Amino acid sequence: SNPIRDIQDRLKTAKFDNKDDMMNLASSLYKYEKQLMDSSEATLCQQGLSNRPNSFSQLSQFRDSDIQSKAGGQTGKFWQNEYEACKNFQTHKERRETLEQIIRFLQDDLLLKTLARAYFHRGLLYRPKGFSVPARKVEAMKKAIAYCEIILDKNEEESEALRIWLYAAMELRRCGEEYPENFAEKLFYLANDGFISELYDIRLFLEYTEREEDNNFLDMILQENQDRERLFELCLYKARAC
Amino acid sequence: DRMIGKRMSADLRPCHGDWVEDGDLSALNAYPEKRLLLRHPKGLCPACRLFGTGSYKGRVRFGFASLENDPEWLIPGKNPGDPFHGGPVMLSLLERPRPTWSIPGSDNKFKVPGRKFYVHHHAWKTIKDGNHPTTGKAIEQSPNNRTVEALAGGNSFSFEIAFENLKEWELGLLIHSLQLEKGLAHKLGMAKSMGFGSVEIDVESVRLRKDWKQWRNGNSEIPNWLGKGFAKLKEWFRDELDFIENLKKLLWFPEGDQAPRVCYPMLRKKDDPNGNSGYEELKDGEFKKEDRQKKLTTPWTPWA
Amino acid sequence: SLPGKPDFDGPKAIGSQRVLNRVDFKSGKAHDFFKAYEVDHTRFPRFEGEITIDNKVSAEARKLLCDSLKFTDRLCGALCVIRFNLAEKTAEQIISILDDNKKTEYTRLLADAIRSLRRSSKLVAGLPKDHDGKDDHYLWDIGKSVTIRQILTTSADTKELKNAGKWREFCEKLGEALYLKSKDMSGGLKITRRILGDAEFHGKPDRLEKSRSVSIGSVLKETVVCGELVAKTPFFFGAIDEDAKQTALQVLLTPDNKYRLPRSAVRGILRRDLQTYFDSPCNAELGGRPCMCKTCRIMRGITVMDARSEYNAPPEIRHRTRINPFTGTVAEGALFNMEVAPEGIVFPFQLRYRGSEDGLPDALKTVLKWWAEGQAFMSGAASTGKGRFRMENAKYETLDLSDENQRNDYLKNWGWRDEKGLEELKKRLNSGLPEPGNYRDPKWHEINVSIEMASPFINGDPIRAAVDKRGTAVVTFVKYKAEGEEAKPVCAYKAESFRGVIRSAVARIHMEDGVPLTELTHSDCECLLCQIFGSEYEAGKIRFEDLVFESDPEPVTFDHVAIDRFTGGAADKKKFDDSPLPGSPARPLMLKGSFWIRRDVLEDEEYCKALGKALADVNNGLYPLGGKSAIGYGQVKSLGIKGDDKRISRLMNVAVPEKPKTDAEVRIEAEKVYYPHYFVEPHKKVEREEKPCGHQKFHEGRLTGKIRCKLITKTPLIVPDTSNDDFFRPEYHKSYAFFRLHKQIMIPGSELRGMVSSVYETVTNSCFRIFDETKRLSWRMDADHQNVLQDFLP
RNA sequence: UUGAUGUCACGGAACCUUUGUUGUCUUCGACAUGGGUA
RNA sequence: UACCCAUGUCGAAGACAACAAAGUAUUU
Ligand SMILES: [Zn+2]
Ligand SMILES: [Zn+2]
Ligand SMILES: [Zn+2]
């Protein structure tokens, strides 16, 4: 891999006002540290960085607290996006490694939201076997809820945090746990938003339909686009709506 | 204005070294990439690859040497009934080297001149007679000088070197650095500048691990390894191997009843009953600043 | 309730929360865990209450109630009977001294060293002096106002701290405070969290379970077994105090600092060994009707006492590290330390079994025989030799509780389960154990090891070096054995280090699908290294103990110095020394010990072949023991094993050319005088490689072996013995003998390494390996108007 | 500070993996100090 | 704001750099 060389290339290009530059620099430095912690074969690289005063000045500027902490959330969000794109081309082992890399890197509302979504997706990988659910599935969903509640304690209108909280609450119910408290109130806020962001939301608006006995949002579902991979699941939601 | 690391080419500085560039490197103390500012951009030189560094274990092991025969001492012991202890010899003052002599001034003209080596000579005969190497006056006890028990010439030792994952050219140049050539010697131990410590090494045997259950005699392959070593030096440096020649001239052992006189000057010629110049006279005569680094880097250049 | 209903600040005022785990039988690794508070009975032995009875209740109901209360023998998880300041001030002062004198870099070392003083206040008088025998040591005389040495001497002489327990408490609190101050300098105390698997798991009972009536019969007997469990190795029952950060791995202790053998561990080990006997794992989950497998039915009759030791000295602290196989150096972050309990501690042991069979079931008789033969492997860290016990002085008898006379006698005495009743019951127990019928051999076998070294040896401990009177930079490992309440020191080679060496020897010469076993990650892996030595997913099948030295040698100290390649003198701060154990060809060091190997490994010819190959290479001298083998320490003369029936040990078994004549010419003039030294000017080009040869295997095409050499003196040689600078006595005039080891004239390996390294550096045109880069030169001005003095202005 | 016709929690080993290790010749010569006289 | 030197004495280095805990599959 030679991650030291990658750090040189980024340090040549990078300027501190530019998101992509800092995203790339943070990514390269994290990969270097990861290879050290793994005792990888890349640890045989004994070389250092060239142009020492320039490299020192640029690294010293990057490691400013606000610069690196800013870059952290953006790198996490970029990885989370690229995961949710390539999720269905990956095998289980490498889906797992991707998500756990995101979690370890991120361990600001952008960071918390990204970490909550990463924990939600890590939990989805576990599947029940026989009449037993893995404990780590419940653990992951509870940690997602815990992260979501930092945002919602100070901004109850935040749609993404609210939706992640509601998804995790529905998975808790699926595992045979109870709903967490104030599920009804938060599920009522979601209906005050009233728009489908992703396929999971269709299952929330049906829960709202069955609870408040309100039919307004069913026409959104019946008009949803058919160009989806999990067509059978969408058709099952269509049947419930009808 | 400069730290001494800036008075030599950056290529000859240690591979894994200290921060000499202008700045306060402690600003990155919390993060792993700080180490990359302390390492050469192109990696490890041969001696670092063979003998190792703080971040890379070495590939050779040096064992203790043991004397083979009954000792032959420089001076007979106080009790003639005991041959296993020798008598004392008193050395003249041992003082620290001064780099300000080799680097005469703040002018950027003056570099680090090179690697120090001590020459071979017999001033130990004067010390055995109890006299100072330069002045010839009797040495006196002081809190600052030493008395030692010293072996004579002709004592023999044996020791072993273990090695692992060497290239053939590496083993060839290691054998070359051990045995040298007939007419050359190493220096070892205390008081090298007073003529003590000339030693010669000879290989007795090389054995090789073929695998976990077979070892084999390697004596037959020694010439091939030496050939590859010298071919490697040609590949790196082509014809311009002058540093080898200067090294050999400093490793040369005087033979044929030759008797070089080797000593440091006195501080002033009035202090020397032989009548040669001291440092205070030399520093504006032969070893004047514009001439000093050339004379010091030319083997066996006389000062008087 | 407690009598008088007193109040406390909270649960932590009365007890400690401890993790209790569940171990998967086949992998040997924990599946999950839960937590509870434990409250010690010596602090809170008693609760009191009332039963209120209506007058119309019959006499027979009253009799049944009273007999039931006497028969009830356990509640809230405990066997029972039913009847009817300085350290803060010192830390602040020492921190002020350190920061006033700009010596804060030593905070961590001081914190660890002061913690080490907790075992005896007399150690304060023993703290090292400087090399001149004077109070200017670089740690203890900082501040030379008062010094640290004076602060500690005053504290040790404070009458409140004269009690050993108070001194231990003082040292521990002070060490923790200095540790936390040292952590601030590194950016604060921060510890990496686990991604997932960090939550407790509680068993869920089943509410749809069906009701059953079961007879079990009137035949019912109780067997009592009494004895001792004796520590034949050091042992480790892990338990972390969350408020104690300084130590990474910690031992379980009572509140008054006695060592504890907990009930939970003993039950877990009994269940494990019973499944080993029957040779069938139990698969049952928590909750639902009780499991009916043969192990669970026995465990439902068993009772065991929680036990503690009379011995209460502080634990040892062991250093531990991990080596990166590619570079041959410590891996990033892999330095940690461990508390260990000494061998020789004795625990009371009492077991009881209730059942309808005529005695102990045959499986339990076999397991107790295994324990009596010294294969009670009870504690954690088994792979590195911790936790082997022998059951000693066993006695037993069976009481028949179907007999009404016996049963009334039993009820009258609460089953003889209190201290006084126990001392009566012991008068009627019979010596020995009941012999098993269907006996099965123990699953582990002992291999005896003996190693011979013809060189010095060190297994370094710098913290012990910081407090020992001798005052070198590093000294060798020692450990302590308990006798009564006395502690005796023994020089040893750590079990962990020896395991590491053997594991490396095995891994470097085997492959899986053409990849060395050193390079694998070992996820979903079935390689022989996982099979023998274990992994992060399953326990290993070979257990290494510490090795001890025969005939108790005494350490020797050697001096060292690094030489600047330009000046030819001592490099600025790099003068140092060590204290290895002396070993030589005439008087070699002898190491003895043993390791335990599971019998299914000895039965497998392939695994035996692998171990044999590795120990053959250790016997050949390719793997030195301990540190600093670059300068000649740790060299194995031979290694031999006994006990395998030769299943492992079956595998363990042209003149040099003339040197050329030199071409060098030097011409000497008889009247001239020459300088004692000259400088070799290097070539401009240094040849570097970004990625040197890795240590993780013997690479094909490269060479490995030994060079044997002859050295001859041409002029007189001085190699001094600097351990004594006054040898020729009839600041003073110093004098030295020639270097000797066990009265043999020798040259150290470090001298030869440095000598040859200088010439090799010059021949290959290498960098100046040793060189004082950061020195700043300066020169005197001269009395010269034009060139100097007219440029300096007021 | 329980609630009562129903508690196998003595129903659960803080267990598992990690080499206090890597690098270093007990060496060795010119240097200190600040004026003085017109 | 030009010129000129004068005196002979003396031990140094005594550990430094790195790591300071990290990991611990539930499945096409
Ligand atoms: Zn180098
Ligand atoms: Zn069972
Ligand atoms: Zn494996």
Numbering used by the authors:
A (entry chain B): 2 to 108, 117 to 251
B (entry chain A): 1298 to 1601
C (entry chain A): 154 to 237, 260 to 319, 326 to 834, 842 to 918, 929 to 992
Paper text:
Here, we determine the protein substrate, structure, and mechanism of a type III-E CRISPR-associated protease (CASP) from the marine anaerobe Desulfonema ishimotonii, reveal insight into its natural function in coordinating a transcriptional response to foreign genetic material, and engineer it for novel RNA sensing applications in vitro and in human cells. Csx29 consists of a three-helix bundle N-terminal domain (NTD), a TPR domain with eight repeats, and a protease region containing a pseudo-caspase (CHAT1) and active-caspase (CHAT2) domain that resembles separases.
The AR is bipartite, composed of AR1 (aa 313–325) and AR2 (aa 356–411), which stack with each other in the inactive state. The target RNA in our active complex is non-complementary to the direct repeat (DR) and the structure reveals that this is an important feature. We note the similarity of this mechanism to eukaryotic caspases which are also thought to be regulated by the conformation of the L4 loop containing their catalytic cysteine. Together, these structures reveal an allosteric cascade initiated by the 3’ end of DR-mismatched target RNA, triggering the AR within the Csx29 TPR domain, and transducing structural changes to the Csx29 CHAT2 domain to coordinate active site residues. In addition to revealing insight into CASP activation, our active complex also provides structural details regarding the interaction with Csx30.
